Amino acid sequence: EDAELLVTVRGGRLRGIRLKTPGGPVSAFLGIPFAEPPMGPRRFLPPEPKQPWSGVVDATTFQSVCYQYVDTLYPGFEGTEMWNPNRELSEDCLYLNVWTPYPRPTSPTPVLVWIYGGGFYSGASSLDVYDGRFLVQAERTVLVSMNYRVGAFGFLALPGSREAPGNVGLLDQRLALQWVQENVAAFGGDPTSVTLFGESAGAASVGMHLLSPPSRGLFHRAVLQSGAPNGPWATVGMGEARRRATQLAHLVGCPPGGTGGNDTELVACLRTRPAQVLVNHEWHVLPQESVFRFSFVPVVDGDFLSDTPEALINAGDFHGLQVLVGVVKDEGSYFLVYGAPGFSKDNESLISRAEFLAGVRVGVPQVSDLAAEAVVLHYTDWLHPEDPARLREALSDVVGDHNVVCPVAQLAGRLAAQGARVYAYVFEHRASTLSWPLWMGVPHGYEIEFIFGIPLDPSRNYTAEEKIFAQRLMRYWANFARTGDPNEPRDPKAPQWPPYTAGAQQYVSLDLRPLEVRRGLRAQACAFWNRFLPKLLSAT
Amino acid sequence: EDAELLVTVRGGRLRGIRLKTPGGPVSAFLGIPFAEPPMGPRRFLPPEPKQPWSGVVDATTFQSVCYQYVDTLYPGFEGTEMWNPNRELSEDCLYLNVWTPYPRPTSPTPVLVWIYGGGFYSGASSLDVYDGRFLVQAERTVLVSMNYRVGAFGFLALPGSREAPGNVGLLDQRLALQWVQENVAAFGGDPTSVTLFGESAGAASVGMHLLSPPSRGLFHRAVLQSGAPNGPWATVGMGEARRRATQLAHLVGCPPGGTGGNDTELVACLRTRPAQVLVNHEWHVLPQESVFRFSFVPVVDGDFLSDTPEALINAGDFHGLQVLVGVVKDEGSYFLVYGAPGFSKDNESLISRAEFLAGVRVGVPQVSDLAAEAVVLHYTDWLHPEDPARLREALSDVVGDHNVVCPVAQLAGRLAAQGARVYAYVFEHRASTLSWPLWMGVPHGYEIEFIFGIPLDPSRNYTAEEKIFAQRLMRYWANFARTGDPNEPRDPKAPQWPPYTAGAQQYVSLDLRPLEVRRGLRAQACAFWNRFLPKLLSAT
Ligand SMILES: O/N=C/c1cc[n+](C[n+]2ccc(/C=N/O)cc2)cc1
Ligand SMILES: O/N=C/c1cc[n+](C[n+]2ccc(/C=N/O)cc2)cc1
């Protein structure tokens, strides 16, 4: 046995596995338990720390995926199944992973902590696209990733009650961050230099930890990729969370007629149901036909979030914090084949104007007819109001701006203007191996494979420049993790990445070309979403 | 070396396998090719006979399942998974199976030919519930079952065209019947005594072979379980079939933008698409939200069916034919969890009056508001018009009578009154192992396991009484196959099963109790569907 595959943490001993890369080996510790299994009476409850164990826990393979819905929209399709669970489902899923360079660093090394996305209803740290061997080998940093409870198991909430307080999936992530503080030094990691990064719901999660005091002391930098905590999908109110939890109980026979009723009896009945039965009725609790909406998400209850993310962002002091935010070029195109009429991944989706007008109500659910008219006015090219291709791109912009780009731009502006040093990007390279149709462009979530250095995998068919592009991206993320600045600490040859300010609003485009500085993250469109539209609904 | 596992047919030599039962072995020949693989340019075309082969074809296991939609409404649930494919999907699927007793019969033995159901969009002869080893062992008959193309591959139709004539899945079954005529003697079977039996869409298939002259000479008796060719779901018009085929082509990008759209180019574009891509858009061509409706079904084009099944049934002479027909006690309950509002398999489905009114429009699609009113009138208990339990059972009766019971009763009456000997039954035993909820009663399709003697399987947990009940039913079906009469010829001690007549309308109840004679296949309700409702729609 290689000596560097044996590590002792506060809970006990572990045996890791050596992973191969074209540039050299790395040491990996996959499936480390950080919490007691949230099963039986522990369902819906906050996580408890993992009790110490005897012997050597095997950490050579990923553990189970938390119970979640499995996408069957396109059986056998690479574009969807790459996000589906690649391990067996189980409520015994609170395990984390650690990648560390070989040989192990002798001095403390900055730590990257990945939080996966998936609309808070799906996701796993074991997905092939989250493989941390290439990032750790090329940049010699320590990478951690954890599983957290999703769906009803992580975010079902009867606010006020203690049997189902909600946000327990966020508490799973926090416990994993406390675990990194107490044990990452055993792998050569620096607990004083922890950079969180996540995508979509993971980016929203990273934002929630910035706004939660108990979590803020567990890390020092943040990267939010195509997500923000102030998104219209990332949180729900206490009243709506209670309605969704009560409807899920009704769909699974809780409570039995006629018994009632209060929260203790409701959760007790829910804890007797098999986990798959809860998953099978998760989508049937959404209030209306929609895209980019999820049943069980973090709740604003006054505990984990003392106020709404919007309020905490405005009143927040962010001095001494560095943040890197960004979006992909086509944030909304992915979600249109999940409900927008006239859309299909297997044709050109050249929708009609009638389909566009109906799609706006699906992309912007429960807004007034007047608000929908305002959306149609802003996103219609009135010189070509019936052109199908322009309408297809317009509805993609509607969903992308409303859900991702403008919530991110709002956060980046308030962050920079209130003490934080902010860097912004727009990812504009479409992978040569992308299986989604061409009209989707650069869809939501398809910068991750380049951040993690997946093009370096010799068993895959990326181009030579995509490999160079991936290495340049890993350099950016690692430089930000080490120094808080994506630019090379001395290299003057490479073009510079200027910080994002609420006035200049500078950002860079990430593609095969060298860095290009641009201004305004869709400033005109986001002024409609962030400034005018909220006033349009106040006066109904 | 058992020589009985080696058989020569017109195409070549085969090697079978011995199957064990508690009562003795049987010889099975699974996966016999009866047609050329309908792949490439042969997609959507009628089948052609399998050309002779050299050597010994292995017939020891089931072959591939025809490409079809896979039910994922309840992952891991036995009630739905039991109908899903248990072999890999392939367009190379035209294979049949024959079970023969051991030792092989020395005198010609009557043949039972099974045609599976599945709404013409799914199904396979390899399903565990269609295991013919117990029926062949206990009753010493020859059992044959075949795969036929389902979905768009079997029933997509551009009527009048040569590239996609339609009904090719029915022609698959006919070719398998011609195969039985030419080869079943090699297994000890009597080609002059062939009894077709099938369930749901298989029963509708059996009925359409009754009404097609080229198929009528290939068999001598018929059993129609919970299905009929005159059902509102079993056939489709030429205009509607063309619209659904053109819509499917549009959803998969056919034809490409800028090219013509005649039938030759449309099918040519469809033949270049991967089979799974066609499956992924099958349900999106139905004209409206509904239950018990399927996209690609037999088409009335004047070829396989010279006229509508209703017309051919009325003007048909059925002298010299014996038919066994029947239904289960709760034909409609299964389909309510697939679209009816307020229904769920995991609760009691105690729907409201408003949900019942909306469910009638789903259960009876495209009827005038006046016609839906007539349905509500007949199926409302006006002394308890808001009782949820009664409304749940009423909507189940609406879907069951409209789609199964009354089409079957209409067929049984016309058959008996026009020369055929008809026997009718109602299956009223709910399996002790049934995984569907109690409120569904005896759902659609759950008499099959008793007809095939599945309770005899030692690895199952059926009761001792259900085993004797299964042996009773297998005797009924085999007696009908041998003599055209389910009653035992050497026997007046058991209760007799009287024939079904258009006047007396006698039938028997099949359950753990001895046979009980009843009169009327829901005569009052079926007079509404078969007599009054057509006149109501004529006057719009
Ligand atoms: O039996 N239930 C089927 C079913 C119910 C609800 N959906 C909705 N849905 C929306 C968005 C997504 C992913 N968005 O990124 C995934 C799934 C699909 C299938
Ligand atoms: O995301 N779309 C999911 C979805 C698409 C299409 N269907 C149609 N469908 C109807 C009837 C049956 C079985 N009937 O007995 C099975 C399946 C269901 C779900």
Curated annotation (Swiss-Prot), chains A, B:
GO terms for cellular component: basement membrane; cell surface; extracellular region; extracellular space; Golgi apparatus; membrane; neuromuscular junction; nucleus. Its EC number is 3.1.1.7. The gene is ACHE. It is a peripheral membrane protein. Galanthamine binds at residues 83, 199-200, 334. PROSITE patterns: CARBOXYLESTERASE_B_1, CARBOXYLESTERASE_B_2. Disulfide bonds join 66-93, 254-269, 406-526. The active site is at residues 200, 331, 444. This is Acetylcholinesterase. Hydrolyzes rapidly the acetylcholine neurotransmitter released into the synaptic cleft allowing to terminate the signal transduction at the neuromuscular junction. Role in neuronal apoptosis. It catalyses: acetylcholine + H2O = choline + acetate + H(+). Interacts with PRIMA1. The interaction with PRIMA1 is required to anchor it to the basal lamina of cells and organize into tetramers. Isoform H generates GPI-anchored dimers; disulfide linked. Isoform T generates multiple structures, ranging from monomers and dimers to collagen-tailed and hydrophobic-tailed forms, in which catalytic tetramers are associated with anchoring proteins that attach them to the basal lamina or to cell membranes. The keyword Signal applies. GO terms for molecular function: acetylcholine binding; acetylcholinesterase activity; amyloid-beta binding; cholinesterase activity; collagen binding; hydrolase activity; laminin binding; protein homodimerization activity. Keywords: Blood group antigen, Cell membrane, Disulfide bond, Glycoprotein, GPI-anchor, Hydrolase, Lipoprotein, Membrane, Neurotransmitter degradation, Nucleus, Secreted, Serine esterase, Signal, Synapse. Pfam families: AChE_tetra, COesterase. Glycans are attached at residues 262, 347, 461. It comes from Homo sapiens (Human). It is found in: Synapse; Secreted; Cell membrane. Changing residue 200 to A: Loss of activity.
